[PDB]
Structures are given as C-alpha cells and as structure tokens.
Amino acid sequence: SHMRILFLSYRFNSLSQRLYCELTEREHEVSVELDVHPDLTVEAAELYKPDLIIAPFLKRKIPQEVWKKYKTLIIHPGPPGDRGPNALDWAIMKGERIWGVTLLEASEEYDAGDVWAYRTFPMRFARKASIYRNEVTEGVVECVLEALENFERGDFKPTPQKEHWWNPKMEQELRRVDWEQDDTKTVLRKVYASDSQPGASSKVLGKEVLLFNAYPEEELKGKPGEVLALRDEAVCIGTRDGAVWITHMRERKKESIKLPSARVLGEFLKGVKEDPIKPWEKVDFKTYREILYEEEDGIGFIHFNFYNGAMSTEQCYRLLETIKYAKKRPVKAIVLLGSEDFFSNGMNLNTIENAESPADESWRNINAIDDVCEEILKTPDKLTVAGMQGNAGAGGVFLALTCDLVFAREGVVLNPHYKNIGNLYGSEFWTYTLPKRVGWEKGKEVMENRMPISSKKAFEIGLIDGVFGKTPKEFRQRLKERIKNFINSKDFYEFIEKKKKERTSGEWLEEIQKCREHELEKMKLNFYGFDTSYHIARYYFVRRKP
Numbered sequence: 039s040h041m042r043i044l045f046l047s048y049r050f051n052s053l054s055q056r057l058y059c060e061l062t063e064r065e066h067e068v069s070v071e072l073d074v075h076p077d078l079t080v081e082a083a084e085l086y087k088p089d090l091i092i093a094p095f096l097k098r099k100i101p102q103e104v105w106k107k108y109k110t111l112i113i114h115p116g117p118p119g120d121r122g123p124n125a126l127d128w129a130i131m132k133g134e135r136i137w138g139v140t141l142l143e144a145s146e147e148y149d150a151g152d153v154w155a156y157r158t159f160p161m162r163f164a165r166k167a168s169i170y171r172n173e174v175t176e177g178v179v180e181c182v183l184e185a186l187e188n189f190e191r192g193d194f195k196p197t198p199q200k201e202h203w204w205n206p207k208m209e210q211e212l213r214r215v216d217w218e219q220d221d222t223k224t225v226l227r228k229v230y231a232s233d234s235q236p237g238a239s240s241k242v243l244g245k246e247v248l249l250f251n252a253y254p255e256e257e258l259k260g261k262p263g264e265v266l267a268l269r270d271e272a273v274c275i276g277t278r279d280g281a282v283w284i285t286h287m288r289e290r291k292k293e294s295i296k297l298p299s300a301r302v303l304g305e306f307l308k309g310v311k312e313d314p315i316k317p318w319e320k321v322d323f324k325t326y327r328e329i330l331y332e333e334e335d336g337i338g339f340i341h342f343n344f345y346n347g348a349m350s351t352e353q354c355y356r357l358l359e360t361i362k363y364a365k366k367r368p369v370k371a372i373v374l375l376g377s378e379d380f381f382s383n384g385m386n387l388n389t390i391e392n393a394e395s396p397a398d399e400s401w402r403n404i405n406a407i408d409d410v411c412e413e414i415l416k417t418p419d420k421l422t423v424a425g426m427q428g429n430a431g432a433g434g435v436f437l438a439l440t441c442d443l444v445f446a447r448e449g450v451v452l453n454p455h456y457k458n459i460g461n462l463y464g465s466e467f468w469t470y471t472l473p474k475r476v477g478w479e480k481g482k483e484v485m486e487n488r489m490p491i492s493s494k495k496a497f498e499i500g501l502i503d504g505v506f507g508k509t510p511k512e513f514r515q516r517l518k519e520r521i522k523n524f525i526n527s528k529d530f531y532e533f534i535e536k537k538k539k540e541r542t543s544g545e546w547l548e549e550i551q552k553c554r555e556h557e558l559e560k561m562k563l564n565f566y567g568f569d570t571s572y573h574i575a576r577y578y579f580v581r582r583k584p
C-alpha cells in the first residue's frame with residue numbers, strides 16, 4: 039500500500055508529471071529517472087530497489103538487466119497489439135475512428151509484452167499533442183491505477199497480445215504539405231499528426247519550413263500556396279479547395295526554433311496585409327480566432343488560445359485590450375478561460391530567445407503580463423474568475439491567481455515555480471496574491487517545490503478555490519452554472535461592496551504598486567545581472583533535444 043515506484047522517462051513530460059501527481063498523492067514514493075544511459079539506468083534501479091518500474095515515456099529499450107529483475111510496465115499510446123514509436127502519428131494519418139492506450143510488460147521485442155490494462159476511446163480530429171494530453175493521459179491514469187490494484191493482489195496474470203501490427207518511424211515525406219495537391223482536410227491531417235513535433239514540412243513563399251498549429255478557413259480564398267492574409271502573426275495559406283491558417287513555423291535548420299509564422303517568414307511577407315477580427319465580433323464561418331469574447335447569462339468569457347500557453351509581449355497586449363473591453367460591458371463576472379490544453383505558461387520563451395536582446399524582450403514581456411494582472415486586479419465592480427481548463431506553469435499560474443476566484447478541471451497539472459527557468463523571482467503580483475491565500479511561509483514552500491502538483495492538491499492547500507470536471511467541456515459547463523448561481527444571489531452584491539471599498543482605496547492601490555516595483559526590481563537583476571542562470575536555462579528549455 040506504500041509501493042516504491044521508479045519512473046523511467048526520456049523527459050519529465052506532461053504525462054509523466056500527471057502520473058507522478060496521481061501516485062505521489064496516493065502515498066507512494068516515486069523516484070524519477072531520466073533516460074541518460076543504460077548503464078546509469080541499471081545503477082539507479084539497483085540503488086533505489088523499486089517494487090515497481092513504470093516507463094511513462096521512453097525512446098529506446100530498457101536494459102533487460104532491469105526488467106527481468108524488476109516488474110517493468112510500459113506506457114504505449116495505442117490500443118492492444120499496436121507496436122511502434124509513432125503510434126498516434128499513424129493513427130491520425132490513417133484516420134482511425136477509434137484508438138486507445140495500452141500498459142504492457144517490458145519484453146525483448148519492442149512493444150510485444152503482455153497487456154496489464156488498456157482503454158479505448160473515440161478519436162477527435164485534432165492535434166496529436168491535444169489527443170496525448172487529454173484522451174491518452176486520462177486513459178493512462180486509469181490503466182496505471184488498475185495495474186497498481188492488481189499488483190497488490192499479486193494474483194494477477196496479464197493477457198498476451200494476439201493480433202498485432204508494426205508501424206515504423208514516420209518519415210517527413212509522408213507529412214509533407216503540398217499546397218497544389220492537398221485539400222484543407224489533408225493539410226489539417228498532416229499538421230495535426232505532426233503537432234507539436236516534428237512538424238509538417240512544406241515550402242511557403244519559396245522558403246522551406248515546418249508547419250505547426252493549423253486551422254481551417256472558409257471565407258478567404260485564393261491561389262493554392264499563396265499567402266492570403268496575416269492575423270496576429272498567423273498566416274492564411276491557399277489550399278487545393280480553400281485555405282488554412284498556420285500560426286507557427288520553424289525554419290528547417292539545426293539552431294532554428296518554433297516561432298509565429300510572421301517572424302519566420304519575415305520580409306518574405308511584404309505584399310500580404312492584415313485581416314483583423316476583434317474578439318467580440320460574431321462570425322458565421324470557420325476562421326482562426328486566437329482570442330474570443332462571448333457573453334452568456336450576464337457573464338463575459340475570454341478564451342485565449344496562445345499556442346503552448348506561451349504569452350508573447352504582443353499577445354499580452356492583445357489580451358489586455360480584450361480585458362479592457364470586457365470591463366465596459368453589462369456583465370457581472372469576467373472569466374478567463376485560457377485554452378483547453380493550457381491555461382497559461384507565462385512569458386513566451388521562444389519570442390524572447392529570438393529577440394535581438396532577450397534581456398530587453400524579457401523586460402517587455404514581464405511588464406506586459408504584469409499589465410494584464412494589474413488590469414484584472416483593478417476591477418472593483420465585477421467578479422473576476424480564472425477557469426483553468428488545462429495545465430499551467432510559472433507566470434501562467436500567478437496570472438490565474440490575480441482573479442478573485444480560481445477554478446480548475448480535475449487532472450490539471452500545475453508548476454507554480456521558477457525552478458526550471460533559472461530561478462526567476464517571479465512577478466504577476468505574486469507577492470500580493472500568494473500570501474493572501476496560503477501565507478508567506480507556505481507560499482515560499484510552494485515556489486521552492488520543483489515537482490508538480492495536481493489541481494486537487496492545489497485545492498487542499500488553498501492555492502485555488504475548487505476543482506471539478508473530468509473534461510474541458512464538463513468543467514466549462516460546471517463553471518458557468520456555479521458562477522451564474524453566485525451572481526444571481528444577494529451574496530454577490532455584498533461581495534462587491536467590500537471589493538469596491540478596498541480596491542478604490544489609495545492604501546490598497548499603492549500597496550500593489552509597491553509589490554509590482556518590488557518584483558520588477560528582482561526580475562530586472564535576473565534579466566541583466568552577473569548571474570545568468572535565467573538565460574542559460576532558457577536556452578536549454580527552448581532548444582532541448584528531441
């Protein structure tokens with residue numbers, strides 16, 4: 039009932055972090071060992087002497103020395119019998135209607151071990167990373183729990199594979215987007231199967247690129263392969279039967295990084311003109327809406343779909359513009375929803391890494407996100423709510439915390455700390471926000487913890503205000519119901535009374551200004567001072583090896 043569990047992962051990735059939260063918070067010890075070398079793996083296992091080894095995320099054989107001596111269970115993102123290193127990629131390229139996940143034993147043949155548990159699910163037409171983070175992750179969690187229960191019994195015998203098949207590593211030629219030959223559906227299937235790695239190769243404006251994060255376009259039309267418009271740095275490209283938006287691209291070179299399309303395409307883009315759509319406009323056709331504002335039951339909902347939850351300096355100002363709009367509206371509550379897969383991961387480290395001066399662009403980014411946080415804070419006459427449908431890390435968590443109420447879906451993983459990015463001091467009014475919820479001592483413990491915590495755990499420690507919902511859709515409905523109830527009550531007006539008296543106080547208003555200028559002073563030293571931890575850690579996060 040207190041098992042010692044060793045994780046063998048290539049990287050401590052989203053699924054590995056979620057499993058670590060699920061097991062740790064059920065009182066098991068989990069040691070995490072990143073795949074460096076087979077000799078080092080046998081070493082780490084021999085010291086730790088686990089009762090059970092889980093491989094949430096592997097790129098290569100586990101040494102037979104380890105799994106013939108410790109029970110080793112492998113995660114595989116395919117249904118029983120599916121073998122190979124790109125299971126999801128193939129499932130999407132082939133158009134599988136039904137898919138699944140398999141927890142199988144380690145064996146001498148790749149993925150040929152007996153099955154300990156599996157789940158199946160219906161497949162959405164969506165990015166590989168979104169399938170992985172939702173259906174695959176929730177399914178994996180169920181298999182691992184059912185496997186830990188069967189391990190306790192010891193009277194469990196796994197099921198050998200029957201029908202099986204092999205899919206090899208998928209080559210670039212198969213993902214290559216050809217605009218004259220590929221319809222919109224085919225472009226989306228190729229980009230979906232390659233998002234977020236390795237990307238679909240293509241040529242745009244005569245430049246060889248990798249495509250990322252596609253969206254169908256039903257109004258704009260033109261010459262296939264012709265760039266039709268810009269819109270918040272995304273480009274819309276003619277296909278064989280219509281058009282598609284591509285928000286992010288990467289030059290096909292060693293040192294190049296994923297960036298918004300306009301930054302990759304650059305001066306190659308001069309003829310093209312913007313085609314704006316404000317978030318509050320209503321639209322009858324499918325197009326790409328980075329930020330979306332809709333009103334339901336006297337409630338203002340701000341969706342913001344920032345790729346990978348990274349918030350560029352410019353995306354912060356686009357968001358602030360929408361919060362200012364929402365604040366002049368006949369609405370009683372304003373709810374920041376983020377996206378389904380991410381609430382926010384703070385500053386965009388890719389646009390920072392790309393800038394002429396990363397220190398300068400860091401200065402811009404932190405002041406832009408602080409401007410968003412200050413605007414939320416300065417809402418005396420409305421209720422402010424953060425709805426975390428997906429994961430959040432670093433500054434993105436503390437953005438959420440400036441809202442009056444913070445809710446999250448079950449299974450959301452949070453990293454409210456800067457231990458991965460050179461120990462930035464942090465801003466986003468955390469010195470005002472965090473103590474008001476957990477106290478200066480526990481808040482420091484939280485920011486000192488480099489391991490993840492669940493949405494469940496954050497509820498306990500008072501970090502957030504409630505956790506519910508299994509899916510993003512479910513969580514959204516629940517959140518709308520709960521907020522509609524509250525503003526349709528007398529409590530809402532008694533809540534606002536206090537908020538109005540305190541928030542328009544010159545005491546409070548200058549208290550938060552001291553906090554901002556305090557955090558920004560610390561962050562300025564991180565950005566510009568002798569210790570360069572931040573820039574070293576950014577370089578490796580942004581350019582990590584796949």
Ligand SMILES: CC(C)(COP(=O)(O)OP(=O)(O)OC[C@H]1O[C@@H](n2cnc3c(N)ncnc32)[C@H](O)[C@@H]1OP(=O)(O)O)[C@@H](O)C(=O)NCCC(=O)NCCS
Nearest residue numbers: 051052234346348383384385386387388431432433458459
């Ligand atoms: C939060 C975090 C621990 C989540 O870990 P994880 O579950 O393993 O998620 P990943 O690192 O795989 O994120 C997936 C993608 O989002 C990107 N991403 C996540 N946060 C990002 C950020 N702030 N800026 C730029 N890119 C980011 C990642 O590079 C990765 O890119 P890819 O899939 O295209 O290869 C981790 O992503 C992180 O530390 N992000 C940076 C947060 C930060 O330091 N912001 C600056 C201070 S506000």
